Design a protein around this ligand. Structure first.
Ligand code: HEM
Ligand SMILES: *[C@@H]1O[C@H](CO)[C@@H](O[C@@H]2O[C@H](CO)[C@@H](O)[C@H](O)[C@H]2NC(C)=O)[C@H](O)[C@H]1NC(C)=O
Ligand SMILES: *[C@@H]1O[C@H](CO)[C@@H](O)[C@H](O)[C@H]1NC(C)=O
Ligand SMILES: *[C@@H]1O[C@H](CO)[C@@H](O)[C@H](O)[C@H]1NC(C)=O
Ligand SMILES: [Br-]
Ligand SMILES: [Ca+2]
Length: 595
């Protein structure tokens, strides 16, 4: 059992044995092991890291070196052969609104982030990785296969930099390389409030004693707040459009501006915090700012938990929901609530649910203006279309009445992501998220497909014929065992996602097991779970059961027509009801009769 307890990219820290709130860092959730689930620590290893040298080098690094006697295929080659498709007609999910995709991304962002190594940002290092395609140290470029249109138009590779690792950022040879999780493992609204003290404070409005989050001061949304702008230059949101020059937003999580709809969902979440803090004050006008901020924060975290566990997860996991996530029995302090490395890849199932276009809709849920539907790629890091082009209401209707992409074994990831991705240093709409997913699954040292089938107690196909029955699909299996020569070598991202979905849910068996297990643990291992006896009063809990994403939308925008079940596919006006019929969060059980 070779290592004990290293801990470098963290500060302190010491714990507050009631202090009815979460820390910002996630520390002091577990009493016995107060770092467990804290941000800026190693991702959990559910299985030992698997690298080409047993320590750090990703499979595929050394040309000569095989995985189980075979070369691992180029990540872009797998992407082109298997992941890509041309025809967007037919690809939509008849049963899930766009919001289903979106909440996926939100939750994902509350739970995990393995950021690239920052070492030598001011070095020829990016210049040598991006310009020359030279693999070495933290440069692990995605090379194009010989028939790739991108060879002709973009150059020899897409640059790709390896994920940071814990202890120090300088090269690691004594135990295996462990990637960092930069946000809190608890489902806690950290994407709203920050996972570091240094950002948590900046986000806040300390100017007034009202516990508000800072809001944008440049611009409004029909009297509704936007998120403050980031400061930093050079800003990729400015970069898209140097005429409009609108910076990215500043949120609790750094990726909040990555696509317009994510920014939209972040905006709704911040408004809800200020709305709660207002209500709490109106009702407790002795509470101070700090009380008001924690108390709103606490409620918002419970809302994110409830929405996720009651409304999202059952329609991801389907028939497997009760198997992995049985109803709640209380806090269990032996549970490890840390996000595992593999989860951060299993949750990328969301990538096949992203459709090629986004729509703005007006109050009749009709096209809003002349160019109301746009290609997804024009919306990466695009804040200008919000501030300058209608606010969030039109985008939110789109969320409600357009549908997610459906995962499809022949049509996996839209070319909007597979060919047109924009990354905030690289200056082009030319990257391939799928290729990146696969390179990163190698970067992070993932065990292969069958390792994971084994972990979850499933069959482990060894032959083409085996893989055909598991996937149900002769030709997908054939392509996968032309590229990988054995299902042992298939990258978990693409193996998990290749499996047909389970009844009433949107992922295959292997992923339902990986996801289901993670979420059970993040709920059961959390001292501040909304439903844990003690955390909220019973009366407070009776109010919280009534929350809905419909109501969030009603309380925070000027939309008055919403569906009752926002994740299901909905059509206007048949499936839409007026906001007055929706349950409200009743805040009266938060009144502090101290008088
Ligand atoms: C257009 C919408 C989206 C875009 C543009 C996008 C883009 C990206 C990018 C660029 C990365 C980093 C990849 C890397 O360097 O390895 C990433 C990672 C990730 N994505 Fe998405 N994504 C989208 C939607 C979603 C959805 C719907 C989900 C889940 C339902 C999701 C789940 C994740 C997760 C869990 C990761 C890893 C985060 C971490 O580092 O822990 N994404 N995505
Ligand atoms: C960059 O943003 C600008 C301003 O936000 C966009 O310009 C608007 O687009 C149409 C003309 O194409 C007009 O209705 C608006 O008056 C334009 N405003 C200005 C100041 O030009 C422009 O489309 C965006 N450009 C790109 C390349 O994304
Ligand atoms: C802080 O709150 C005050 C009044 O409550 C408001 O006028 C001001 O605009 C807020 N500042 C920020 C930066 O959100
Ligand atoms: C808590 O979790 C542990 C380990 O997962 C399990 O063995 C134990 O039974 C659980 N304890 C309770 C009281 O539920
Ligand atoms: Br992202
Ligand atoms: Ca979190």
């Amino acid at each position: 059992s070779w290592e004990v307890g290293c801990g470098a990219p963290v500060p302190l820290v010491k714990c507050d044995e009631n202090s009815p709130y979460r820390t910002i860092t996630g520390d002091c959730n577990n009493r016995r092991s107060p770092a467990l689930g804290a941000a800026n620590r190693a991702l959990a290893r559910w299985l030992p890291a698997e690298y080409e040298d047993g320590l750090a080098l990703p499979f595929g690094w050394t040309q000569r070196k095989t995985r189980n006697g075979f070369r691992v295929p180029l990540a872009r080659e797998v992407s082109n052969k298997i992941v890509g498709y041309l025809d967007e007609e037919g690809v939509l999910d008849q049963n899930r609104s766009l919001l289903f995709m979106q909440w996926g991304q939100i939750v994902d962002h509350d739970l995990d982030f393995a950021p690239e190594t920052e070492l030598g940002s001011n070095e020829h290092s990016k210049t040598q990785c991006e310009e020359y395609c030279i693999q070495g140290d933290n440069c692990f470029p995605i090379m194009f296969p010989k028939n790739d249109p991108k060879l002709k138009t973009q150059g020899k590779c897409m640059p790709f930099f390896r994920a940071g690792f814990v202890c120090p950022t300088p090269p690691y040879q004594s135990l295996a390389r462990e990637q960092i999780n930069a946000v809190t493992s608890f489902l806690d609204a950290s994407l709203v409030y920050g996972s570091e003290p240094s950002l948590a404070s900046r986000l806040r409005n300390l100017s007034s004693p009202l516990g508000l989050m800072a809001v944008n001061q440049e611009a409004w949304d029909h009297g509704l707040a936007y998120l403050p702008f980031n400061n930093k230059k050079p800003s990729p949101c400015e970069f898209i459009n140097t005429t409009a020059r609108v910076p990215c937003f500043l949120a609790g999580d750094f990726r909040a501006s990555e696509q317009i709809l994510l920014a939209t969902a972040h905006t709704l979440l911040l408004r809800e915090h200020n709305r709660l803090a207002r209500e709490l004050k109106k009702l407790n006008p002795h509470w101070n700012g700090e009380k008001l901020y924690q108390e709103a924060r606490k409620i918002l975290g419970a809302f994110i938990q409830i929405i996720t566990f009651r409304d999202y997860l059952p329609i991801v996991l389907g028939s497997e929901m009760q198997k992995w996530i049985p109803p709640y029995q209380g806090y269990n302090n032996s549970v490890d609530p840390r996000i595992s490395n593999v989860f951060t890849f299993a949750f990328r199932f969301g990538h096949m649910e992203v459709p090629s276009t986004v729509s703005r809709l007006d109050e009749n849920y009709q096209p809003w203006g002349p160019e109301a539907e746009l290609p997804l790629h024009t919306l990466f890091f695009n804040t200008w279309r919000i501030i300058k082009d209608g606010g969030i209401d039109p985008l939110v209707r789109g969320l409600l009445a357009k549908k997610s992409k459906l995962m499809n074994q022949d049509k996996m990831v839209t070319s909007e992501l597979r060919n047109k991705l924009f990354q905030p240093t690289h200056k082009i709409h030319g990257f391939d998220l799928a290729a990146i997913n696969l390179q990163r699954c190698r970067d992070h040292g993932m065990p292969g497909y069958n390792s994971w089938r084994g972990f979850c107690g499933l069959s482990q196909p060894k032959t083409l014929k085996g893989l055909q029955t598991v996937l149900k699909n002769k030709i997908l299996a054939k392509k996968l065992m032309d590229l990988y020569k054995t299902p042992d070598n298939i990258d978990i991202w693409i193996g998990g996602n290749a499996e047909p979905m389970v009844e009433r849910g949107r992922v295959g068996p292997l992923l339902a097991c990986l996801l289901g297990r993670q979420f059970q643990q993040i709920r059961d291992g959390d001292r501040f779970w909304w439903e844990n006896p003690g955390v909220f009063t019973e009366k407070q809990r009776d109010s919280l059961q009534k929350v809905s994403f419909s109501r969030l939308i009603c309380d925070n925008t000027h939309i008055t027509k919403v569906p009752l079940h926002a994740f299901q596919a909905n059509n206007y006006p048949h499936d839409f009801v007026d906001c007055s019929t929706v349950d409200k969060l009743d805040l009266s059980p938060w009144a502090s009769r101290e008088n």
